[PDB]
Design a protein around this ligand. Sequence first.
Ligand SMILES: O=c1ccn([C@H]2C[C@H](O)[C@@H](COP(=O)(O)NP(=O)(O)OP(=O)(O)O)O2)c(=O)[nH]1
Ligand code: NA
Ligand code: NA
Length: 326
Amino acid sequence: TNHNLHITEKLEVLAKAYSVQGDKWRALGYAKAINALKSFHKPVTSYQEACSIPGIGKRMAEKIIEILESGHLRKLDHISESVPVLELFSNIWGAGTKTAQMWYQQGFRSLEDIRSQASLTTQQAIGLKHYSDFLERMPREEATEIEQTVQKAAQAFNSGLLCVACGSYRRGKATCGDVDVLITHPDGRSHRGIFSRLLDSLRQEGFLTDDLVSQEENGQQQKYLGVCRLPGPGRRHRRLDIIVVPYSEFACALLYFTGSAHFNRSMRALAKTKGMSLSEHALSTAVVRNTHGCKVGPGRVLPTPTEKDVFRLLGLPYREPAERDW
DNA sequence: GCCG
DNA sequence: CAGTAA
DNA sequence: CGGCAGTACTG
Ligand SMILES: O=c1ccn([C@H]2C[C@H](O)[C@@H](COP(=O)(O)NP(=O)(O)OP(=O)(O)O)O2)c(=O)[nH]1
Ligand code: NA
Ligand code: NA
């Protein structure tokens, strides 16, 4: 359906350069425009037409028309030579633009440089060991197998636990970057202490191979981010994210964890225009903010038993997970 | 970068 | 806290 | 001019 491939391919290069150099708001603008172009019904053929599309302004319009007339984009030719190396480094899990830029300034140019000379955090060393694996997407059928491994282990010590795979899986994608498993209990209390029992059970059977984020000390753990691998030959290491939530938060946690990320941001932005606030925990009304958009007063939580309730309270038509890519 |  | 991530 | 989402770990 992308009727503007020659344009977007060039804009994506520029967008990625801004992102990895840390100019996140400018990169957000490019991401907004690129999506608007991927979804326009026709080839965009004029400056006046390009401007009419939400997310495209005068500046983006004159880049589009430069591409159309000449097949090239002058700005690409002056992208810093550092950008491919910065992208290489920031694809290490646990390293972002700041770390990538420091490693670059220190003279490193390759993952061999990083391995042999760089200071690495515990997470980054795991990211580097699984560098290729964390860039691959698994078939969704393997995500099912991972969800079932987690569900069988959780339900072995409490059969009442509800487990649901979210993210790209629940949105129906053919491949998945990780598996996002949401766990809750329909009664309202038994979700306490389950992380400790769950993670121990998945470690005893050899399924978890490394931990990236897991605060197991004080019992208030909300998320586990780590690495798993199914048994047998031909298996890769896969990213696993688990969250455990109170039942009263199930609809908002499901909404958050199904995403997409841009869908969540657009929904939360709409809530803010209404004096409301939407998080993974709750939809709140009568939220008080200052002129900068920052919360200065808490509001009150609205009951949201189902995802449909959240849309309804925001004045929105319900959208099925497969329709939430943007 | 866009846009209110 | 800054950095990174979901 | 200035916001662009709202959260949870790490050290
Ligand atoms: O910045 C973010 C990132 C993720 N999220 C939510 C939405 C996202 O779908 C969910 C899971 O995050 P993932 O990184 O797993 N993204 P997703 O599952 O959609 O795609 P994939 O895992 O296949 O890359 O967390 C946000 O709200 N903000
Ligand atoms: Na990274
Ligand atoms: Na995911």
